[PDB]
């Protein structure tokens, strides 16, 4: 188990435009193409990113492109927020990944409210922290999801996602 395939897991794979879970234009491995309503946006989003007039339709090889392009981006986010960096230095590699994972799922503004989790995760408090994080809309909105990364910051194991 690793970042890439955990967020395979999390994220699943679809070559064709769709909607994520939150209702916006997405493709791939829950690559975010827009927050517009409009089709024509996130198409013109798709041949931007892929470099080509695509319709609406991408290969595996383009998938996994904007999948490690993402993670990157997720990775080097954190390396750059000043309330991000000391808590994902502080941790081991395990619980790093499930870090990643929040970011790529919400961005660094999605993340924001988490001061408070951020703070008992440096503090490895993991139980208070595990039921910390579940107070929030992300839990609510994605339990499923929300509690395989919490477990992951709660244990430090990769035990989410074994069977999966
Ligand atoms: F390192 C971390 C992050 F970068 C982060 F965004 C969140 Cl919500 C975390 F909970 C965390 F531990
Ligand atoms: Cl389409």
């Known amino acids: 188990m690793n970042i890439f395939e955990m967020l395979r897991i999390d994220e699943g794979l679809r070559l064709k435009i769709y909607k994520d879970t939150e209702g916006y234009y997405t493709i791939g491995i829950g690559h975010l193409l827009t927050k517009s309503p409009s089709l024509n946006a996130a198409k013109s989003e798709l041949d931007k990113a892929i470099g080509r007039n695509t319709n609406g339709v991408i290969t595996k090889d383009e998938a996994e492109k904007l999948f ?50 951020l703070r008992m995760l440096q503090q490895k408090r993991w139980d208070e922290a595990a039921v910390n994080l579940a107070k929030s809309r992300w839990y609510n909105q994605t339990p499923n999801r929300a509690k395989r990364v919490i477990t992951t910051f709660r244990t430090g194991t990769w035990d989410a996602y074994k069977n999966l």
Do not use: C, H, W
């Open 68 to 117: 490690n392009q993402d993670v990157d981006a997720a990775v080097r986010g954190i390396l750059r927020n000043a309330k991000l960096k000391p808590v994902y230095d502080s941790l081991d590699a395990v619980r790093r990944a499930a870090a990643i994972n929040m970011v790529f799922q919400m961005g660094e503004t999605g993340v924001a409210g988490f001061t408070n989790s």
